Point group: C2
Chain length 192, copies 2
């Protein structure tokens, strides 16, 4: 039943993202959907199943949307900026599930953790490769290519701790700023 | 007793940083110091007291060391690079307590959370102000000054998720790279 399913997922995501996974019980979820503990197991076998599903659909979505961006523009600089705007858009729309991705992966077992870690590596690879399309002269040094990519991810992944998507600075404005800073540097940024 | 005190703190920091705060019990700590649950309360009143103390001494240390850096060099570009090298040095030496700062603040009540949040704001202020000493022309826009500062923090604070301080790239090398990228941009970075 694809309606009540997503309410559980929706309501669980919110709790896992405030108090966290170990803090949130199956009972907590049951009564957040204003429901009995029984009716949850009609859709999910475990608390881990709820988590595994929301993480899976979320990274799967991010990967597909990245691909559409990749397969769209001709120009490397445009594709890169579009990828960053996508990630921040997904924050603006899907903050809870985003935070849970960035925060809750360890709560899982080993096989599914690593299936999801594999998907996160795909996503990282897309960004790394798009950066090296801007600087093909830098592709020879894989060590520093990984460093530069992960420093970039830090800028955007840390946003959940401080950034409010309904504030003065829009997701698109933040993305443009992030790219101008990362590509061209704080010291060359035009001052209004 | 200032000897056994720090073992508790040391051993607790390690557990809070792997499995987390709610996951780690007072019993877990008692037996990590290969000890009875009684002897912990000789030094600490609560699990929260253990946490509050390690967070307090850690942010207090970071603040003092930042000040020594600030009061040292004449040149803004040097002071900024020295601040980043300091933060990454503290990761190389104090990873566990660092992760716990970046990760566990919410496990606390309200008054002490906000005393510590206030100290984190001081630290952020040091970095913001040092950036605006590089670009005084940008100090007029406080909104974007906060955005640029927090994007910077993301690069360095996200390191706990991916960076190994005993690897190919040293803490000082990572700091130099982070600063070159942030100040001068990915597109102007010299390629070996």
């Amino acid at each position: 039943y694809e309606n009540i399913r997503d309410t559980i997922i929706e309501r669980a995501a919110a709790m896992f993202a405030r108090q966290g996974y170990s803090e949130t019980s199956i009972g907590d979820i049951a009564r957040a959907c204003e429901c009995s503990k029984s009716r949850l197991y009609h859709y999910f076998d475990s608390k881990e199943a709820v988590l595994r599903d929301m993480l899976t659909t979320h990274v799967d979505s991010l990967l597909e949307r990245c691909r559409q961006v990749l397969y769209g523009s001709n120009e490397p600089k445009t594709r890169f900026l579009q990828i960053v705007k996508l990630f921040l858009e997904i924050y603006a729309t899907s903050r809870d599930r985003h935070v849970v991705m960035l925060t809750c992966l360890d709560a899982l077992p080993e096989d599914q953790r690593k299936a999801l870690i594999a998907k996160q590596r795909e996503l990282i690879a897309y960004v790394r490769d798009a950066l090296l399309q801007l600087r093909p002269d830098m592709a020879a040094n894989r060590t520093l290519a990984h460093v530069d990519t992960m420093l970039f991810f830090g800028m955007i992944n840390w946003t959940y701790t401080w950034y409010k998507a309904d504030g003065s600075v829009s997701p698109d404005a933040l993305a443009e700023r992030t790219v101008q800073l990362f590509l061209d540097g704080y010291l060359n940024l035009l001052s209004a």
